[PDB]
Design a protein around this ligand. Sequence first.
Ligand SMILES: *[C@@H]1O[C@H](CO)[C@@H](O)[C@H](O)[C@H]1NC(C)=O
Ligand SMILES: *[C@@H]1O[C@H](CO)[C@@H](O)[C@H](O)[C@H]1NC(C)=O
Ligand SMILES: *[C@@H]1O[C@H](CO)[C@@H](O)[C@H](O)[C@H]1NC(C)=O
Ligand SMILES: *[C@@H]1O[C@H](CO)[C@@H](O)[C@H](O)[C@H]1NC(C)=O
Ligand SMILES: *[C@@H]1O[C@H](CO)[C@@H](O)[C@H](O)[C@H]1NC(C)=O
Ligand SMILES: *[C@@H]1O[C@H](CO)[C@@H](O)[C@H](O)[C@H]1NC(C)=O
Ligand SMILES: *[C@@H]1O[C@H](CO)[C@@H](O)[C@H](O)[C@H]1NC(C)=O
Ligand SMILES: *[C@@H]1O[C@H](CO)[C@@H](O)[C@H](O)[C@H]1NC(C)=O
Ligand SMILES: *[C@@H]1O[C@H](CO)[C@@H](O)[C@H](O)[C@H]1NC(C)=O
Ligand SMILES: *[C@@H]1O[C@H](CO)[C@@H](O)[C@H](O)[C@H]1NC(C)=O
Ligand SMILES: *[C@@H]1O[C@H](CO)[C@@H](O)[C@H](O)[C@H]1NC(C)=O
Ligand SMILES: *[C@@H]1O[C@H](CO)[C@@H](O)[C@H](O)[C@H]1NC(C)=O
Ligand SMILES: *[C@@H]1O[C@H](CO)[C@@H](O)[C@H](O)[C@H]1NC(C)=O
Ligand SMILES: *[C@@H]1O[C@H](CO)[C@@H](O)[C@H](O)[C@H]1NC(C)=O
Ligand SMILES: *[C@@H]1O[C@H](CO)[C@@H](O)[C@H](O)[C@H]1NC(C)=O
Ligand SMILES: *[C@@H]1O[C@H](CO)[C@@H](O)[C@H](O)[C@H]1NC(C)=O
Ligand SMILES: *[C@@H]1O[C@H](CO)[C@@H](O)[C@H](O)[C@H]1NC(C)=O
Lengths: 451, 44, 125
Amino acid sequence: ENLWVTVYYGVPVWKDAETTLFCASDAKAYETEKHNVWATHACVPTDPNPQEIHLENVTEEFNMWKNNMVEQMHTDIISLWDQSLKPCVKLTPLCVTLQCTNVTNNITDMRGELKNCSFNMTTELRDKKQKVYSLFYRLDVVQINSNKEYRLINCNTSACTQACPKVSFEPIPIHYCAPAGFAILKCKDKKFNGTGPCPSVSTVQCTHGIKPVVSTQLLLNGSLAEEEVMIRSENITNNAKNILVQFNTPVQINCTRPNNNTRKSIRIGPGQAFYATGDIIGDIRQAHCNVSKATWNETLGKVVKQLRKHFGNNTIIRFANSSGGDLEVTTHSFNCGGEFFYCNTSGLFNSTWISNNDSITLPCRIKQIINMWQRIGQCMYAPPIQGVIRCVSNITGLILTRDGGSTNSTTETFRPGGGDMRDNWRSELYKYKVVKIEPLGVAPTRCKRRV
Amino acid sequence: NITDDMRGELKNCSFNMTTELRDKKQKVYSLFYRLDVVQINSNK
Amino acid sequence: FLGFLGAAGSTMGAASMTLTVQARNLLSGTVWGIKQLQARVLAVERYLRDQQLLGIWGCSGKLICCTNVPWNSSWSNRNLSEIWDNMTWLQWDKEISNYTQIIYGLLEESQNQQEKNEQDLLALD
Ligand SMILES: *[C@@H]1O[C@H](CO)[C@@H](O)[C@H](O)[C@H]1NC(C)=O
Ligand SMILES: *[C@@H]1O[C@H](CO)[C@@H](O)[C@H](O)[C@H]1NC(C)=O
Ligand SMILES: *[C@@H]1O[C@H](CO)[C@@H](O)[C@H](O)[C@H]1NC(C)=O
Ligand SMILES: *[C@@H]1O[C@H](CO)[C@@H](O)[C@H](O)[C@H]1NC(C)=O
Ligand SMILES: *[C@@H]1O[C@H](CO)[C@@H](O)[C@H](O)[C@H]1NC(C)=O
Ligand SMILES: *[C@@H]1O[C@H](CO)[C@@H](O)[C@H](O)[C@H]1NC(C)=O
Ligand SMILES: *[C@@H]1O[C@H](CO)[C@@H](O)[C@H](O)[C@H]1NC(C)=O
Ligand SMILES: *[C@@H]1O[C@H](CO)[C@@H](O)[C@H](O)[C@H]1NC(C)=O
Ligand SMILES: *[C@@H]1O[C@H](CO)[C@@H](O)[C@H](O)[C@H]1NC(C)=O
Ligand SMILES: *[C@@H]1O[C@H](CO)[C@@H](O)[C@H](O)[C@H]1NC(C)=O
Ligand SMILES: *[C@@H]1O[C@H](CO)[C@@H](O)[C@H](O)[C@H]1NC(C)=O
Ligand SMILES: *[C@@H]1O[C@H](CO)[C@@H](O)[C@H](O)[C@H]1NC(C)=O
Ligand SMILES: *[C@@H]1O[C@H](CO)[C@@H](O)[C@H](O)[C@H]1NC(C)=O
Ligand SMILES: *[C@@H]1O[C@H](CO)[C@@H](O)[C@H](O)[C@H]1NC(C)=O
Ligand SMILES: *[C@@H]1O[C@H](CO)[C@@H](O)[C@H](O)[C@H]1NC(C)=O
Ligand SMILES: *[C@@H]1O[C@H](CO)[C@@H](O)[C@H](O)[C@H]1NC(C)=O
Ligand SMILES: *[C@@H]1O[C@H](CO)[C@@H](O)[C@H](O)[C@H]1NC(C)=O
C-alpha cells in the first residue's frame, strides 16, 4: 500500500562485543608523591560526578562466568606488576653458601623459625670482599650437605629481583571506562545470581571503584550484598566448580606482627644496596590473626541457611579444613603493610550443622621470597619493615568447594579453596556487560523521493 | 672409536666452569669441533 | 531529558525524535599508552565507514532519509499501524536481519546509481 524503504541513523540498537577499556582515577589521592605498584600517571582523571541513566522496558541477559572484563583486568594487573619491578636492584650475587645457626635468645615457643646466617658478600670495589650477617626465616633457606651449610631456596630456579623500596602495595580504586561507540550495562536486580535475564537494566557511563585486593580462601574489602547472603556458581551440580559466597554483613579481622624488627643496609655494588634484618629488640612472638566467635557463628549460620535451599531440606552441612597442596593454596595468604602472611584457617571451618568476647586466634607465618601469579622463574624479595605492623580488614566473601559425595545425600562437606585470581574479581565485575552500538536501520514509511 | 678417514676434527676439551653458587666452580668437558677452536700460545 | 540511549524501551514513534543524542555519542574526545591509540583509530574508522555507506546512497547529511525503493525484499509481513506504535527498535532488528544485505544493495544500484544517471543526461540539453 505504497510503502517504501526509509533510512534512519542513530537508532538505539546494541549488540554484544569485546573491546579494550581504560582508566579513571579520583583526584583526591592522585596528586600525592607516593608511588604505587599500580600506576596512576598513565590513567586519566575521572569525571567529577557519574552519569546514571535508567532504562525502562529493557530486559538483557547477563553471564558472570563468560565475561572478558575479568580476563582484561587479570592481564592489566599482571602487566602492571611486571612493569613495577624493572628500574631497580636485582639480587644476583646472593647465591652463596651460608653458615646458619639458631637464633635462640627469647623463644616463647617459634623454635626454629628464625636463623642467624653469615656469608661473604662483594663490596663497591671489585677486588675486595666483606663479611656480613643477616636473619632469614626457615621457609627461605634450604640445607645443603653448630654451624651448618644452607642456601637460598631460589638459587637453582632463577636469580630474581629485589622489591623496589620506593613503591607501596596498598590497593587503590580503579574505574574501567568503555570507548566511544560502546556502552556499559549495569544490572540493578538485588537478588541476581549473575546468570540469566536482569529486570533492572541501567546504562552506566563507567564502573565504580574496584580495589585489586589479592587474597586466597577469603575476600577482603569487597562489595557487600543488599538483601541476603548470595551463593553463585556456574554449575551447582558439578563438584569441580568453585562456589562464591557474598556476605550481607562483614566480620572484622585484626592481624599483627609482635616482633620489633631492625633493617640494615648492605652495599653490594656501585649504587646497589641490600636490606637485611640485623637484630630483633624486645621479645620474639608469633604473628596471629583473630576473629570474633559470635559474629562468625552467626555469619556461618546464615550461610548454611541460604545454602540449604539448593541441595535439599534434611541434609547436614559440614565444614572442614583444606585438603593439601602448596602453602599458597592451603593457607589464607594476604598482605599487611608490605609483609606477606600465611595464616592457618583450620579453626574457622570446623563445625557440623543439624537441621533441628572470645576470639579465634589463627597462627600465621611470614615469608620473604614469594612467587605469585602462579608463575615459575620470578620472585619478589620483600625487604624487612622496621617497627610493628597492624591491619584491620573486612571479610566480605568466601570461596568454598565441594567434595565427591557418597550415597547421593545425607552429607555435604564444604572446604575452602582458591588459587586463581580471576575468582577474586569475578565477585565484583558480575553486574557489568559491554555492548556495541549499531545506529543504522531501515523501516517502511510512505515517502517517495522527488524525481 | 675408529677414526678411519675423518682426521682430527673433534677435540676433547676440559675446562673450569661456574655453578649456581657464586663461590664454587666445576670441572667439566665437552667435544668441540676443529672449526670452532683456535690455539693460543698431551694438553695444549 | 532522556540522555544517551534513553528511548531504548520506548516505541518507534518516540525513539525517532532523539536520534541526535545517539548521533553525537559515536564520536567523543606500554599499558594505557597504546590502548587508547588503537581504540580511537578503530572508533574513527567505524564512524567513517558508516558515514560513507550513508552517502553512497542519496542520504548524505540527513538524520531521517526516505527513498523510493519498494517494500519487496524485506518481508516484514506487517502493516505500518502496529509497527510504529507496538514495537521497539530492538525487536525490529530481530525480525529483519537476514534481509539487511539484499536491501543494502537495492539502495546502491536501484537507487542513486541509476537515479544519478538520468540527471547527468537531463542537465545536458
Ligand atoms: C647473630 O649472630 C651474630 C654473630 O655472627 C650476633 O652478633 C647477633 O647478635 C646474632 N643475632 C641474634 C638475633 O642472635
Ligand atoms: C668467607 O671467606 C673467607 C675466606 O676469604 C672464609 O674463611 C670464610 O669462612 C667465609 N665465610 C663464610 C663462608 O661464611
Ligand atoms: C540463576 O537464576 C536463574 C533464574 O532466572 C535460573 O534459571 C538459573 O538456573 C540460576 N543459576 C543457577 C546456577 O542455579
Ligand atoms: C553441570 O553438571 C552436570 C553434572 O555433572 C552435567 O551433567 C552437566 O553437563 C553440567 N553442565 C550444564 C548443566 O550446563
Ligand atoms: C621498636 O623499636 C624502636 C627503635 O628501633 C622504638 O622506637 C619503638 O618504640 C619500638 N616499638 C615498640 C612497640 O616497642
Ligand atoms: C579489632 O580491633 C578493634 C579496635 O581497633 C576492636 O574494636 C575489634 O573488636 C577487634 N576485633 C577482634 C576480632 O578482636
Ligand atoms: C523445607 O521444608 C520447609 C518446612 O519444614 C519448607 O518451608 C521449605 O519450603 C522446604 N524447602 C524446600 C522444599 O526446598
Ligand atoms: C586439616 O586438619 C587435619 C586434622 O583433622 C590436619 O591433620 C591437617 O594437617 C589439616 N590441614 C591443613 C591444610 O591445615
Ligand atoms: C595448620 O594447623 C594444623 C592443625 O591445627 C596443622 O596440622 C598444620 O600443619 C598447620 N599448617 C598448615 C600449613 O596447614
Ligand atoms: C574442631 O574442633 C574440635 C573441638 O574443639 C577439636 O577437637 C578438633 O580438633 C577441631 N578440628 C581440627 C581439624 O582442628
Ligand atoms: C556456634 O558454633 C557451634 C559450632 O562449634 C554450633 O554447634 C552452634 O550451633 C553455633 N551457635 C549458634 C547459635 O548457631
Ligand atoms: C568494613 O565494613 C564497614 C561496614 O560494616 C565499613 O563501615 C568499613 O568502612 C569497612 N572497612 C573497610 C572497607 O576497610
Ligand atoms: C681448573 O682450575 C684448577 C685450579 O682451580 C687448575 O688446577 C686446573 O688446571 C684448571 N683446569 C683447566 C684450566 O682446564
Ligand atoms: C513498559 O511496559 C509497561 C507494561 O506493558 C507499559 O505500560 C509501559 O508503557 C512501557 N513503557 C513505555 C515507556 O512504553
Ligand atoms: C522480490 O520478492 C521476491 C519474492 O520472493 C524475490 O524472489 C525477489 O528476489 C525480490 N526482489 C529482489 C530485488 O530481491
Ligand atoms: C495489514 O496488517 C494488518 C495487521 O495489523 C492485517 O490484519 C491486514 O490484513 C493487513 N492488510 C493487508 C492488505 O495485508
Ligand atoms: C537468515 O539466515 C540465517 C543463517 O542461515 C538463518 O538462521 C535465519 O533463519 C535466516 N532468516 C530467516 C528469517 O529465516
